[PDB]
Design a protein around this ligand. Sequence first.
Ligand code: NOJ
Length: 443
Amino acid sequence: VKKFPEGFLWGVATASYQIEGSPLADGAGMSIWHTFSHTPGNVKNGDTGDVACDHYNRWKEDIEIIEKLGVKAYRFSISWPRILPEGTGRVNQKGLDFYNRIIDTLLEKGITPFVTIYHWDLPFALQLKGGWANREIADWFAEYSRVLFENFGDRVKNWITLNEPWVVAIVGHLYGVHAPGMRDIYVAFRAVHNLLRAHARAVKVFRETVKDGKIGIVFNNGYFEPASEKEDIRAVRFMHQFNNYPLFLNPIYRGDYPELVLEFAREYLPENYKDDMSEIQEKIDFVGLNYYSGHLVKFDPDAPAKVSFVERDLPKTAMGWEIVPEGIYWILKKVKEEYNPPEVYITENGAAFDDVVSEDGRVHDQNRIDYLKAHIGQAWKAIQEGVPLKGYFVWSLLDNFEWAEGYSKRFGIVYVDYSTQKRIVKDSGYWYSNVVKNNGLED
Ligand SMILES: OC[C@H]1NC[C@H](O)[C@@H](O)[C@@H]1O
């Protein structure tokens, strides 16, 4: 048996653009994911978020599923352009109404809301003014955060500024695979910097408006290992510093970017970037870490960053991501060791597999159970060695729009039949329900 501390928060997680559909309903402005997915060639099968899971209409039913499952926390995001259609200025009362109903329902049923302020659906109107590339986004984001705090902060007490800002910056503005679809290394590092400043400004407003709450920030993380005992160890050191929480937590805790990031990227950061560092050090209450995968890494003289991945013969998910459960232990231990934050949450962990509804009307995703079980086990371990892990969130409640992969990748513990919008709880969902009831594993 592996029992978790009393009060440990078992959660599920979603994001606004991935589940809601109806992106232009009730006076909402367009987002960058609306225009990105409506551009031919950007998303698999030309999928968009126009309908998605239709959560915009079926929100009550989805929450009832969370209730029925006994899950104690729900992490969801708010669509910035539903709230401020032009990004700043005018507030759309109908957008506030939609999240107000979700918030009140959750509290009625005793589910704890964890609100992600920004999960990638920037208002299109702000992208026209440069989006994350524009220093002024620190103001725009502050104003948006303030609206949320004032309207919801009486009831919501756990807040996340940014979801995966490395992805936002690098995959959105260097790789061009996500909105707004740009390929410019200098823009991508200005986005990194501005994301930090916007985060710090939001936290500052939070101290003024929600005096009894807690606020953090969420990072993607990979478990990187060297291909050989050789400068292979250093390329792993680079990937951890660049791709993992240190890119943002070295600034927040120590007032500068990590060493190896500066050696690679100093030419691409703003000239006097150090002038912003003391404001960036605004105290946070928790660190959220997402974790999915491990990667074997080698120095490579001819790669963009002097680094390439090498495929390993390990079990992979439908994403082709290698399943390495000890990565979640490693990253929890390392975060304590490097920055010692007062609280940590696993804000996302999960997997995509080729789910099908059997003749018996059930989704037998034993592979997802194996995945979840192995990772929850490893997180248990870190708790026993003193990591202040206060919660764990399965990505995702529902199969949903998986960004540039569209509907073809299913992460849910609940199946969605997109032709009817019927929800079918998967075996993994029933399994997790039992984990939550028992506050841990038992076999
Ligand atoms: O790729 C899986 C999952 N990981 C990271 C993102 O936060 C989420 O939106 C995405 O669907």
